[PDB]
């Protein structure tokens, strides 16, 4: 695997370069929000984002060295976490709001338009506020998102993955050391960031639970992504 031979800087650059584009919503301001149209907008957005997530995964150093089925497994496990950490990241500069797309910025009040979504909404807003108060850098964000990809499904099927995870850890520490943070601040910040991944996992689970409940529109790709969590 060529991913282990990489330096910290070229690990960062490889991840920044791999970053997916910000997509736009079909959002229509002349029409108001119903529960169905809101979930329709979010589903359509997520479905398109997923296609780019797959291109991004292939460019995550070490991911292509995996078995195709191992790649499938990791993505099936982590896809909603990855969307969520993306949503949280681009919502940092909009306190109290969630930037699903540049033309789709929503507050928690609009989260009430669909039954119960305000709960996972407040959780996301909290994570965003957490990142903002931490001054989460983009270089750190890309590391966190790659970690989620490789870690989330690593215990559901390995040594290579853990070695890449170690590598990404080295990269995170390298980023913090460059920012001037002391050795104590380095491990503390590292811990703070990784603990947030536990909350992202929780949010994904709650969200996933709801998603395979309203299967009782959704694209065929999502239906397969969702079925993997059953």
């Amino acid at each position: 695997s060529l991913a282990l031979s990489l330096t910290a800087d070229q690990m960062v650059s490889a991840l920044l370069d791999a970053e997916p584009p910000i997509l736009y919503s079909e959002y229509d301001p002349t029409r108001p929000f119903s529960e169905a149209s809101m979930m329709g907008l979010l589903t359509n957005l997520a479905d398109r984002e997923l296609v780019h997530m797959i291109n991004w995964a292939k460019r995550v150093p070490g991911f292509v060295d995996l078995t195709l089925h191992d790649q499938v497994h990791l993505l099936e496990c982590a896809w909603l976490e990855i969307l969520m950490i993306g949503l949280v990241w681009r919502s940092m500069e909009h306190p109290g709001k969630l930037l699903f797309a540049p033309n789709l910025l929503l507050d928690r009040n609009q989260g009430k338009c669909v039954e119960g979504m305000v709960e996972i909404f407040d959780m996301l807003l909290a994570t965003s506020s957490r990142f903002r108060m931490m001054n989460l850098q983009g270089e750190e964000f890309v590391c966190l998102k790659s970690i989620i990809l490789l870690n989330s499904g690593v215990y559901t099927f390995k040594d290579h993955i853990h070695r890449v995870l170690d590598k990404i850890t080295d990269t995170l520490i390298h980023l913090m050391a460059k920012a001037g943070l002391t050795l104590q601040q380095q491990h503390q910040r590292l811990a703070q960031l990784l603990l947030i991944l536990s909350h992202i996992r929780h949010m994904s689970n709650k969200g996933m639970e709801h998603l395979y409940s309203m299967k009782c529109p959704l694209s065929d790709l999502l239906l397969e992504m969702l079925d993997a969590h059953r």
Partner: peptide
Amino acid sequence: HKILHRLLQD
């Protein structure tokens, strides 16, 4: 198979 299979190869 899966759609995700095809997307990963392409």
